[PDB]
């Protein structure tokens, strides 16, 4: 009688999740360092706080700090279940980072590793961490960054008499660069584990204090008059993405939007515009050049960080060479600043272009989100998303056609995805939000909007591709790198790319061909031709008059 049902296991080993979390803490190791993070904290003492104690987390004066961490970890494993073990660790390590930070003489070498350890604590089981702990940790990292006031506030240009006679030390600069970078990365991590909670509970996180603190630290990160650290710009726009993404995908959307003042947005969006109008040039990414025009990713902060692997991790060998590894000390091991930098490969510049192009995709992606938040007209969906986005579209087409075609870089495709993306940031702005596109602001970009749409409608002629035989001769010219990519994908990394059945590679000699069309700047996708057509041709606003329009159509044929 019903001999069908799947039988249970009578000895189900539910794994002790706090033990797995303990083991994930104990072998947490940042990428490039020689020792584990707990094994670095075993080699740190603190000789100005004579006795640290918050809630039975006693640290003696000459004692190793990681001894006290592992004593807390062993002592609170027996007692607490997982959601209490998490916020116990969060508040204890937060209080330790706090009184190491606010002190006049004491070195702060433990602080980066404690922040990275805190990040390992947060994102282990995001379903387990209760969000009041996330609120407390977010407020602590925001006022921790406003403690470190001076890392993101170095001036643009120094004195002419700034003599570089100096010990040229890098170790303290390396410490607080790690503090700022791991802090902003922890802000990103707190908000994605808050993003992963069920969608009825976001009001337990947000209040006025969250948004005012992030407003301050966001003005701090996306700087204007100081030298930009690009490591914090990635996370500081990813946080804004997480905010605008959860505003869309929650139910009580008003009590976030009522909690947000419009001044927060019109301070955010101007800095996003000023980020969007910067340039990405591989030959002087890593060079130090003129400010606020090239996203440059400085040589003196080039390491991975917590979430994403952003550089080549040139300063990861110096993280392990910051301590003496056979000694219990407080001051850092001395790193000379001018030894780094040795010249073999500009490929590092290409992948840093890849990250910066994803950054601009991120910025106009959150433009695309907060169009959909404020579908009705407001202070902020206000027509300058024609000006700045059309400037961006027109120039990233123009110097695409002038400079990038035939340059065999891997970053062509994504760079001709951005234009292909930002037309849509035009298009639904044009179609669904015309009521705020004011008559003067459209004439601020009448050149660039119409020229950018015209470089899509020029592709309806299409006497270029028209076959198969010579288009692959074009992709031997412009897109050999993606041929290498798809052969390494086909022979190694894709399940469906073997024993190809004469319909899966006819799809390849469809889609590589439309890809190399989209790279060659002739024959875009037909859908984007339609979206560019129904802005220029459609009669929502006289961009052109009918005797001025056919003056554009004669330069294709028509």
């Amino acid at each position: 009688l019903k001999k069908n049902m799947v039988p249970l296991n009578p000895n189900r080993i539910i794994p002790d999740e706090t033990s797995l979390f303990l083991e994930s803490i104990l072998l947490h190791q940042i990428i490039g360092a020689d020792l584990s993070t707990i094994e670095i904290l075993n080699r740190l003492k603190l000789d100005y706080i004579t006795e640290f104690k918050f809630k039975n987390f006693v640290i003696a004066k000459g004692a190793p700090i990681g001894k006290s961490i592992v004593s807390l970890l062993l002592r609170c494993k027996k007692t607490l279940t997982l959601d209490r073990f998490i916020d116990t660790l969060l508040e204890d390590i937060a209080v330790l980072i706090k009184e190491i930070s606010v002190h006049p003489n004491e070195s702060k070498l433990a602080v980066p590793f404690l922040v990275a350890l805190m990040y390992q604590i947060v994102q282990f089981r995001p379903s387990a961490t209760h969000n009041l702990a996330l609120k407390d940790c977010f407020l602590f990292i925001c006022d921790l960054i406003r403690i470190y006031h001076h890392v993101l506030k170095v001036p643009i240009h120094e004195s002419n008499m700034n003599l570089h006679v100096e010990p040229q030390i890098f170790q303290y600069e390396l410490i607080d660069y790690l503090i700022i970078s791991y802090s902003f990365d922890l802000l990103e991590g707190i908000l994605r584990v808050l993003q992963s909670h069920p969608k009825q509970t976001y009001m337990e996180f947000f209040d006025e204090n969250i948004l005012k603190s992030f407003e301050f630290v966001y003005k701090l990160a996306l700087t204007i008059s100081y030298k930009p650290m690009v490591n914090v710009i990635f996370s500081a726009v990813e946080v804004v993405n997480i905010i605008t993404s959860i505003i869309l995908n929650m139910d009580n959307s008003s009590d976030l939007k009522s909690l947000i003042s419009g001044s927060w947005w019109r301070d955010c969006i101007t800095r996003l515009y000023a980020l969007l109008e910067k340039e990405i040039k591989s030959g002087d990414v890593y060079n130090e050049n003129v400010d606020t025009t090239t996203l440059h990713m400085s040589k003196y902060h080039d390491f991975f960080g917590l979430i994403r692997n952003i550089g080549d991790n040139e300063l990861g060998g110096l993280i392990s060479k910051l301590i003496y590894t056979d000694r219990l000390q407080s001051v850092p091991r001395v790193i000379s600043k001018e030894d780094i930098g040795m010249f073999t490969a500009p490929i590092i510049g290409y992948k840093m272009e890849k990250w910066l192009l994803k950054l601009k995709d991120e910025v106009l992606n959150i433009f695309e989100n907060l169009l959909m938040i404020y579908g009705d007209d407001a202070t902020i969906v206000n027509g300058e998303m024609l000006i700045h986005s059309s400037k961006f579209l027109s120039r990233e087409q123009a110097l695409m056609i002038e400079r990038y075609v035939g340059q065999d870089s891997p970053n062509l495709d994504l760079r001709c995805h951005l234009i292909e993306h930002t037309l849509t940031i035009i298009y639904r702005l044009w179609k669904d939000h015309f009521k705020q596109l004011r008559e003067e602001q459209i004439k601020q970009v009448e050149s660039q909007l119409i020229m950018s749409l015209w470089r899509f409608l020029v592709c309806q002629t299409e006497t270029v591709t028209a076959n198969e035989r010579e288009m692959r001769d074009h992709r031997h010219l412009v897109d050999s790198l993606h041929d290498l990519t798809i052969k390494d994908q086909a022979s190694y990394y894709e399940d469906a790319f073997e024993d190809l059945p004469e319909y899966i590679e006819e799809e390849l000699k469809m889609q590589l061909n439309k890809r190399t069309g989209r790279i060659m700047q002739v024959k875009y996708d037909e859908k984007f031709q339609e979206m560019a057509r129904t802005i220029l041709e459609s009669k929502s606003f006289d961009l052109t008059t009918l005797e001025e329009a056919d003056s554009l159509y004669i330069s294709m044929g028509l």
Partner: protein, 615 residues
């Protein structure tokens, strides 16, 4: 076999209702909806068992349906008025065919890519009222699967409902483990770039739930093991295609946490002996791919900490590792490579037979299955295993131009090679002799080689530089901010005087009597190559006085007013290169020649690049 002509006439019937001209998208609801009767006639002709298993008449069916939906983006948002648009009706119906084709990797990738075209490249037209009526539909139908997954704990579930529940969860997680290019910002949890999305934590939650189910259940059905290998296939596909995927190196990862999760998940999958099935390559593929991502890069410690292998060793048996001969073979290869890179250099020796380095073997054999050579023709496994064995050789590293000469003249570097004059003479004897008229592709490869080899000639008196360590140009490939024509040198060496490759180029391509018909592609290639030459060298004098446009500026006349826009805007990029010289342009006469040339185009379709050509 009889209904291939029906689809072949039906694609023409769909394309017949295009337009009167070549421009047709028609995004709006036209006042005429008869093709929806064909739409119903497509997907109802798809779920069947007899000859749907034929490859071509299924692929042409789904390509016909994608050509219907591509040229008609209004069909998705036609508001089939239950409560929603009919794209939600399309998702689950399209899911049923994919869940009926779970085992064939072609039939589900080729479906989900065109689903990506249907949601990314088609619901950009609609946005706010329609993005949130499909990004919630995926969340509802995924909430349904993870909800119905947990009642198999309490025992009151069925056995076939368990199967298609797991398979539907597999297909929903497989659609979202693609790259970012398949599903763009169409679905709201896949919105964030930078390899770090809302789907990541939700996905890791779902894989932990399905591992908890696999721990909770107890069943030794053979096809249950078959569908239980699919989750580790999915978790290795989750992390291998978030890679940055550079030129020819192993594709570096974006997030170390996803690698830790995938290694921990498949290690927990192996510990409980889940999914041991004979002659099945899936676990071996996952292990070899994840080790290939972690050969000697920054994640190698991350491989050895989270995927331990040294506690299954059992040296004393021909059954070396416990699982299955493919999985044991792949894990034995991984253990061989870890043990190789562990030992010092003085302990290793070269084979001279398999071209691999190897340690002092054993008192036993222990070396059979690592280089036996490899298995049944699972075509990716043996090249994975060759890469794992041959990345240690530290040979001449792969380079782009060395690839494109080895792709073109294979087996060239069995000689000196990095001597620069012999590759010029080999290119000379191939560029003068070995074509009658047939190389309408090989000569385009030759001119991209002649473009890239011009820079390598320019890097002497730039005496140290070499054929191997030239990845890209420092002037033509990377670029800096500012005025881009400041970087090129006024007193660079002349192209006719010193550069032998322009002698080759003018000897073949610019003195051939049929420049007016090569093809469009060879003209584009000769323009790129001449762009690189004149960006590294001074161009010759455009006019001596005897008429005499110098056989390359004549190509600028031939391509600048040409019919296609691509040759126009490609040939405009060398007009400024003629304007920069000394002892040819010091008293500004090439400038005057280009000025009185640019004043002579009253042709309308040349009005675009002319504005570029002035600027």
């Amino acid at each position: 076999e009889s209904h291939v002509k029906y689809l072949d006439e039906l694609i023409l019937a769909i394309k017949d209702l295009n337009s009167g001209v070549d421009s047709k998208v028609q995004i709006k609801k036209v006042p005429s909806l008869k093709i929806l009767n064909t739409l119903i006639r497509n997907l109802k002709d798809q779920r069947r068992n007899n000859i749907m298993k034929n490859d071509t008449i299924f692929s042409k069916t789904v390509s016909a349906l994608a050509l219907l939906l591509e040229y008609n983006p209004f069909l998705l948002v036609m508001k089939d008025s239950n409560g929603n648009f009919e794209i939600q009706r399309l998702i689950d119906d399209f899911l049923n065919i994919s869940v009926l084709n779970y085992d064939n990797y072609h039939r589900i990738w080729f479906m989900r890519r065109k689903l990506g075209s249907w949601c990314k490249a088609c619901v950009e037209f609609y946005g706010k009222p329609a993005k949130f009526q499909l990004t919630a539909h995926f969340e509802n139908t995924m909430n349904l699967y993870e909800q119905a997954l947990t009642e198999v704990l309490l025992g009151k579930t069925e056995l076939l409902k368990f199967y298609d529940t797991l398979k539907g969860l597999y297909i929903l997680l497989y659609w979202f483990t693609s790259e970012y290019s398949t599903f763009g910002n169409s679905i709201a949890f896949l919105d964030s770039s930078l390899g770090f999305t809302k789907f990541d934590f939700n996905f890791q939650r779902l894989i932990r739930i399905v591992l908890y189910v696999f721990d909770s259940c107890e069943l030794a059905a053979l096809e249950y093991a078959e569908i239980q290998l699919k989750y580790i296939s999915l978790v290795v596909d989750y992390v291998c295609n978030r890679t940055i995927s550079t030129a020819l190196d192993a594709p570096a990862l974006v997030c170390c946490e996803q690698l830790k999760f995938v290694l921990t998940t498949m290690h927990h999958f192996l510990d409980n002996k889940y999914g041991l099935l004979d002659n099945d390559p899936t676990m071996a593929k996952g292990i070899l791919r994840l080790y290939s991502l972690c050969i000697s890069n920054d994640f190698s410690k991350c491989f050895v900490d989270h995927f331990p292998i040294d506690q299954w060793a059992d040296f004393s048996q021909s059954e070396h590792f416990p699982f299955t001969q493919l999985t044991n073979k792949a894990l034995s290869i991984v253990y061989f490579d870890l043990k190789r890179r562990s030992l010092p250099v003085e302990a290793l020796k070269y084979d001279n037979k398999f071209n691999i380095w190897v340690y002092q073997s054993e008192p036993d054999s222990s070396l059979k299955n690592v280089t036996s050579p490899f298995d049944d023709r699972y075509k990716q496994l043996e090249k994975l295993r060759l890469l794992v064995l041959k990345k240690f050789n530290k040979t001449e590293r792969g380079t782009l131009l060395k690839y494109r000469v080895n792709q073109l003249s294979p087996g060239f570097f069995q000689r000196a090679g990095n001597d620069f004059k012999l590759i010029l003479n080999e290119a000379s004897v191939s560029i003068q002799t070995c074509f009658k008229t047939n190389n309408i592709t090989r000569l385009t490869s030759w001119t991209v080689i002649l473009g890239r080899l011009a820079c390598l000639e320019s890097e002497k008196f730039s005496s140290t530089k070499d054929m191997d360590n030239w990845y890209v140009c420092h002037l033509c490939d990377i670029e800096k901010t500012g005025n881009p024509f400041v970087r090129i040198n006024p007193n660079r060496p002349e192209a006719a005087g010193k550069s032998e490759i322009f002698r080759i180029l003018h000897s073949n391509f610019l003195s051939h009597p049929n420049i007016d018909e090569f093809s469009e592609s060879l003209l584009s290639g000769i323009l790129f190559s001449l762009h690189r030459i004149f960006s590294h060298f001074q161009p010759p004098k455009l006019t001596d006085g005897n008429g005499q446009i110098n056989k390359s500026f004549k190509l600028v006349q031939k391509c600048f007013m040409n019919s296609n826009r691509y040759l126009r805007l490609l040939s405009t990029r060398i007009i400024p290169l003629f304007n920069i010289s000394d002892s040819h342009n010091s008293e500004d006469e090439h400038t005057a020649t280009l000025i009185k040339f640019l004043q002579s185009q009253k042709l309308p379709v040349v009005k675009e690049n002319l504005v570029i050509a002035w600027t």
